[PDB]
Design a protein around this ligand. Structure first.
Ligand SMILES: OC[C@H]1O[C@@H](O[C@@H]2[C@@H](O)[C@H](O)O[C@H](CO)[C@H]2O)[C@H](O)[C@@H](O)[C@@H]1O
Ligand SMILES: OC[C@H]1O[C@@H](O)[C@H](O)[C@@H](O)[C@@H]1O
Ligand SMILES: [Ca+2]
Ligand SMILES: [Ca+2]
Length: 270
């Protein structure tokens, strides 16, 4: 009734499926994903209680040495739905058919209930990420004619990659109240096109609903990629990037109590 994964005990890449009905198709998949840490003392552990539905991440890392300082952040511990295109991990037991071509997908709301506790000024964000690839089921990484979209609904001490492009308004719901929120749009080229939406009023805890197609429509419109609507929306990942090249100690704890994807009866891109 409790799933647990732990770094470094389970290796340098701990991860596990959440498959509550035991049917062999995970509803979500979790990864500790310390992708840019070469070595650290301490541990990071992610627990999911299958009765309460609470996902709890506890991280206490020190003596951090990065794989490549130019990649800036240290890792992105996360939970995701769909096909993560960097590896053979996937979760497709849900109402939205990911992966699917962006030209064929309906819009959906993404609602997350969570609480973030970075310790001692640790730079972090809480970001939702999607990869858009040329093939339907990619498992070996990302090419220069493909896109990452990120949506940061909390941050402290981290700036997205690239250059600011603009500000957009997006209607969201925060703690039960519909509100017009502002997101900065940032664009970079980092081996693939990266577009990040960073909220101007970070939300450290609570329940937030966002309309996914507002973000993907803007990422499509500012993209330099050809044939954007042929790309497949592989996944929806939710996690915390953390750290900078001068962070040597990273203590952080967070919780997620609910992720819901709600299909709408309208195209993703408008
Ligand atoms: O390396 C990928 C990560 O880049 C992070 O942005 C960095 C900026 O904060 C910093 O000022 O510049 C460096 C080098 O240009 C950037 O890499 C993004 O915050 C992360 O989302 C991204 O994964
Ligand atoms: O930066 C490239 C990518 O590295 C992979 O190893 C990680 O699992 C991804 O989350 C990350 O985005
Ligand atoms: Ca299942
Ligand atoms: Ca995968």
């Amino acid at each position: 009734k409790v799933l647990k994964i732990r770094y470094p005990d389970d290796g340098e890449w701990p991860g596990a499926p959440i498959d509550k009905d035991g049917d062999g198709n995970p509803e979500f998949y979790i990864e500790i994903n310390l992708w840019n840490i070469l070595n650290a003392t301490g541990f990071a552990e992610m627990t999911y209680n299958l009765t309460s539905g609470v996902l709890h991440y506890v991280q206490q890392l020190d003596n951090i040495v990065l794989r490549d300082r130019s990649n800036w952040v240290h890792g992105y511990p996360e939970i995701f739905y769909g096909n993560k295109p960097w590896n053979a991990n996937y979760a497709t037991d849900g109402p939205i058919p990911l992966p699917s071509k962006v030209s064929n997908l309906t819009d959906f709301y993404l609602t997350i209930s969570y609480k973030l506790e970075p310790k001692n000024g640790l730079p972090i964000n809480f970001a939702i990420e999607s990869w858009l690839t040329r093939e339907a089921w990619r498992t070996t990484g990302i090419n220069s004619d493909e896109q990452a979209v990120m949506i940061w609904i909390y941050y402290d001490g981290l700036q997205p990659a690239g250059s600011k492009v603009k500000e957009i308004v997006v209607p969201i719901i925060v703690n039960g109240t519909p509100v017009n929120a502002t997101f900065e749009v940032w664009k970079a080229n980092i081996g693939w096109e990266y577009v990040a939406f960073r909220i101007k009023t970070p939300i450290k805890e609570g329940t937030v609903t966002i309309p996914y197609g507002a973000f993907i429509s803007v990422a499509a419109n500012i993209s330099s990629l050809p044939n954007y609507t042929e790309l497949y929306l592989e996944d929806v990942e939710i996690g915390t990037e953390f750290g900078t090249p001068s962070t040597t100690s990273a203590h952080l704890e967070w919780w997620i109590t609910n992720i819901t994807l709600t299909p709408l009866d309208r195209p993703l891109i408008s």
